[PDB]
A paper describes a structure:
The JN.1-sublineage KP.3.1.1 recently emerged as the globally prevalent [name]-[name]-2 variant, demonstrating increased infectivity and antibody escape. We investigate how mutations and a deletion in the KP.3.1.1 spike protein (S) affect hACE2 binding and antibody escape. To investigate the effects of N30 glycosylation introduced by [name]Δ and two [name] mutations (F456L and Q493E) on the structure and function of the spike protein, we determined the cryo-EM structures of the recent [name]-[name]-2 variants KP.3.1.1 and JN.1.11 along with engineered variants JN.1.11 + [name]Δ+Q493E, JN.1.11.1 + [name]Δ, and JN.1.11 + [name]Δ. The spike proteins exhibited three conformational states: “one [name] up,” “all [name] down,” and “flexible” (i.e., one or two RBDs disordered in the density maps due to flexibility).
Residue numbers in the entry:
A (entry chain B): 710 to 847, 851 to 1150
B (entry chain A): 610 to 679, 689 to 709
C (entry chain C): 860 to 1059
D (entry chain C): 710 to 759
E (entry chain A): 1110 to 1150
The structure:
């Protein structure tokens, strides 16, 4: 007979980090296997289409990563802008909206996310560098035929998609995600999200300042949590480190002999006459072929993993940011209210805003109230008792109300319900109609 | 033609010295050489106007074949993401 | 073979905690503190969730409880009677055994060499010829290891996808009530209960 | 103008079986390829990081 | 869009006219009170 019901609540903001893309690599078959060697290349041609297969696999990966980024971020048909007032009922979005004063027009949180992740490749034109460094320091430094392609969407252009999405959800809620963007006052969007999680609108309006303060504090906590904890962005750093490790391994394999007299192809050609050099080269070719097949296989498996993660991130954007989801733990821990995306290198970070019950109290309950020989059931909510009187309350928020014929429905007698208790069920019309004459 | 990973100065110098391995050359005049993040793009005129991406190049730069001025040619441009729509938000 | 980080007892403890949470508090423990609710009232909520009024449950509560007890007994009899029901998990074990047995069997392959035993190669042949035959055996064994690891990575990806689906099912079927048709079984979803199984 | 409406119901319990984990293995590359053989190990070193 | 008259059947009451920010003054029509007045006269 005991039921515990929340008497208070906390608005909580949590963080979910998902990879969206991996570095787009390109491998120069002739340079890796037979770098600047005609005799080796001619021997390489006797193995057929192998490189062509490698080139198609790496091109397909690069295209797949561009496809994943486009699907994850380019889900809005227009670039939405926020109003110049930046007043949303008292809610402070200065930590998630673009900061106009700095280059790249990223939010405070996005610059923090970018500063935390260290990018090993950062593809761009690098030939200009050449020497004068202490050492070449790479991950082939281009020289061994391994390069990194730039993304089609730049970091600024991802930030613009994030800004459009934030402006859309802040000013129109979920309406723009299913057609035209319809403006709505923010407290009225949140009130409807509250209705979505089973808590009435008056709870939000009565406590609007408390909710706004809890939201602003939670956002500040997110900023401090990301700043303080150096390992928060683990998944993205792991993706970067795994691609750097794969390329470091592929380049380092060039120094191996694989049974040859020397790992340097020019030494083989200088020291031996063609008929023996061809054998030593064939041994080196076999070793390099094994290294390239291993590298590409690992890149394809990782690409499949990234595709699955990107598909999950796009799914979460659609159900969490452009809508409201009733799937438990899908959009953060707790009851989902709303989410905000943030750009991160090679991925996306979601800020999930949820409603969490707090300060519960345990009341006595009953399946039904028997009045004039009839079983009265709630239309919405549950019955509670404070020890002297019975009330109807919401399941997610304590709010005692008088049990009346406008809040309950009647079906059957009071003998069938096992836990039914005796209490008065008031009827508003009768008291006034009895009040009306007598 | 996009020459990946190199400066347009280096490519122009290699062309003048006849040091490049491809035996074909792309006709090059002023305004036809554009420096991108991916590499040096030769044979496409860069314009200020953005459009929807047709043929992607990289780092936000796309190319397409369009009629210019009065005369069709390949152009390069910064990708447009969509039309702008400012929502009339009010209390 | 390395042991799992969480032992069978620890998995059983997680399953027990999930069952206690679901039975005592339903969907509540997955989104705030656990709040006790009488079980018939939890079911009344779930029935309302699927579009059936609370009085249907309360008028027929003993019918529903009897159907539940019968269905659970049928589950126990179904799993006992039909060994193929758990084939999805048995295949995971069997494939792994086969992969390991295959890799060991590859040590007996010659790969074109005169013998599979390195000590025989070293004993009967001069270093040069022994080096050629050994290098050949090294190449064959490296190829076998690359095949094994590639297959393990592919199966690991399949297991990862299955584990992610299982995690989604725990959150949406056990720690809540799902509206996804046929996601949490056939029919309108009322509730789910996890059970631990080896490797799954 | 014809609609079918249930007059009774059944509470059904079904079973879904999903893999969660696989046996965790570890391979001694040198021992597998070149078990207790110094010469084999010395040739194996020429294959680098495999 | 389908405008309806605001009545005590379409809305619910909780709290007074103070805590809600942006509340506006408008008449909410009771169905019963009008009907009861018709029953009288
Ligand atoms: C929305 O929230 C942000 C913070 O998340 C508010 O910005 C903050 O505004 C206060 C008061 O203007 C700043 O405090 C001042 O900071 C300067 C820094 O040099 C210091 O010298 C002053 O003595 C004072 O401490 C605070 O730093 C600033 N924080 C940030 C990150 O900008 C913003 O005003 C809020 N807007 C609304 C409409 O609520
Ligand atoms: C809706 O369907 C349920 C069954 O799914 C009906 O309950 C079932 O009613 C039959 C006939 O009254 C019961 O059969 C009898 O069971 C006793 C058990 O001792 C046996 O001795 C009799 O010979 C006969 O077999 C059946 O047990 C019962 N099932 C349950 C779970 O209670 C229910 O009456 C149906 N309701 C309507 C409105 O049609
Ligand atoms: C249970 O609730 C009832 C009604 O809310 C409480 O009775 C009221 O108490 C206030 C003082 O706090 C009085 O002003 C009202 O006139 C009382 N109303 C009635 C109908 O008695 C009751 O005290 C509560 N009991 C407990 C144990 O919380
Ligand atoms: C609720 O009130 C009804 C009466 O309005 C109670 O019914 C009576 O119960 C007593 C025994 O407790 C019988 O001796 C009477 O004959 C019953 N009268 C009627 C008209 O049913 C009912 O028991 C009360 N329930 C509770 C839980 O107090
Ligand atoms: C709605 O009506 C109430 C009265 O029923 C208004 O409250 C009065 O506002 C005037 C403003 O000059 C005050 O002088 C009165 O003392 C107020 N009376 C009470 C009882 O509060 C209220 O301002 C009206 N609101 C709007 C938006 O018109
Ligand atoms: C409320 O919960 C506490 C938890 O310790 C328990 O001790 C107490 O008896 C409960 N009261 C009721 C009325 O259920
Ligand atoms: C709920 O908790 C907040 C925490 O700041 C507090 O300010 C508020 O008064 C509490 N409300 C109730 C009804 O306990
Ligand atoms: C090309 O070289 C010039 C030399 O002055 C340099 O300024 C320019 O930044 C270089 N471009 C790239 C893409 O490296
Ligand atoms: C693009 O616009 C800028 C504006 O200052 C101009 O300087 C530049 O030459 C323009 N580019 C082209 C290709 O017209
Ligand atoms: C919304 O209300 C705030 C309250 O401070 C006010 O400053 C702002 O100008 C209002 N905006 C509109 C469009 O009425």
């Amino acid at each position: 007979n005991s039921i515990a019901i929340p008497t208070n609540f906390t608005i909580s903001v949590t963080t979910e980090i998902l990879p969206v893309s991996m570095t787009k690599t390109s491998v120069d078959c002739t340079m890796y296997i037979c770098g600047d060697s005609t005799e080796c290349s001619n021997l390489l041609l006797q193995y057929g289409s192998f490189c062509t297969q490698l080139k198609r696999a790496l091109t397909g990966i690069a295209v797949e990563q561009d496809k994943n980024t486009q699907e994850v971020f380019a889900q809005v048909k227009q670039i939405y802008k926020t109003p110049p007032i930046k007043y949303f009922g008292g809610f402070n979005f200065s930590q998630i909206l673009p900061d106009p004063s700095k280059p790249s027009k990223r939010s405070p949180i996005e610059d923090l996310l970018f500063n935390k992740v260290t990018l090993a490749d950062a593809g761009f034109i690098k030939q200009y560098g050449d020497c004068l460094g202490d050492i070449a320091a790479r991950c082939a430094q281009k020289f061994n035929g391994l390069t990194v392609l730039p993304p089609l969407l730049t970091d600024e252009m991802i930030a613009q998609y994030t800004s459009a999405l934030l402006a859309g959800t802040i000013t129109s809620g979920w309406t723009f995600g299913a057609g035209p963007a319809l403006q709505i006052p923010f407290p009225m969007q949140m009130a409807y999200r509250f209705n979505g999680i089973g808590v009435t609108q008056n709870v939000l309006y009565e406590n609007q300042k408390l909710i706004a303060n809890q939201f602003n504090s939670a956002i500040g906590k997110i900023q401090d949590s990301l700043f303080s904890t150096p390992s928060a962005l683990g998944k993205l750093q792991d993706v970067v480190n795994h691609n750097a490790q794969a390329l470091n391994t592929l380049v380092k394999q060039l120094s191996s002999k694989f049974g040859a007299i020397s790992s340097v192809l020019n030494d083989i050609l200088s020291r031996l006459d063609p008929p023996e050099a061809e054998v030593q080269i064939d041994r080196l070719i076999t070793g390099r072929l094994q290294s390239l097949q291993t590298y590409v296989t690992q890149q394809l498996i990782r690409a499949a993993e990234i595709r699955a993660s990107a598909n999950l991130a796009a799914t979460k954007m659609s159900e969490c940011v452009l809508g409201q989801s009733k799937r438990v733990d899908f959009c953060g821990k707790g009851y989902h209210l709303m989410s905000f995306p943030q750009s991160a290198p090679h991925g996306v970070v979601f800020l999930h805003v949820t409603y969490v019950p707090a300060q519960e109290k345990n009341f006595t309950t009953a399946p039904a109230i028997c009045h004039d020989g009839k079983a009265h059931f709630p239309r919405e909510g549950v019955f509670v008792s404070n020890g002297t009187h019975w009330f109807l309350t919401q399941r997610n928020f304590y709010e005692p109300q008088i049990i009346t014929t406008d809040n309950t429905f009647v079906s059957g007698n009071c003998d069938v319900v096992i836990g039914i208790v005796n209490n008065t069920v008031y009827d508003p019309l009768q008291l006034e109609l009895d009040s009306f004459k007598e | 033609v996009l020459y990946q990973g190199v400066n347009c100065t280096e490519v122009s110098v290699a062309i003048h010295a006849d040091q490049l391995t491809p035996t074909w050359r792309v006709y090059s005049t002023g305004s036809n050489v554009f420096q991108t993040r991916a590499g040096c793009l030769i044979g496409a005129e860069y314009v200020n106007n953005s459009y929807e991406c047709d043929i992607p190049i990289g780092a936000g730069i796309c190319a397409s074949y369009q009629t210019q001025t009065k005369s069709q040619s390949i152009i390069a441009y910064t990708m447009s993401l969509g039309a702008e729509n400012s929502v009339a938000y009010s209390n």
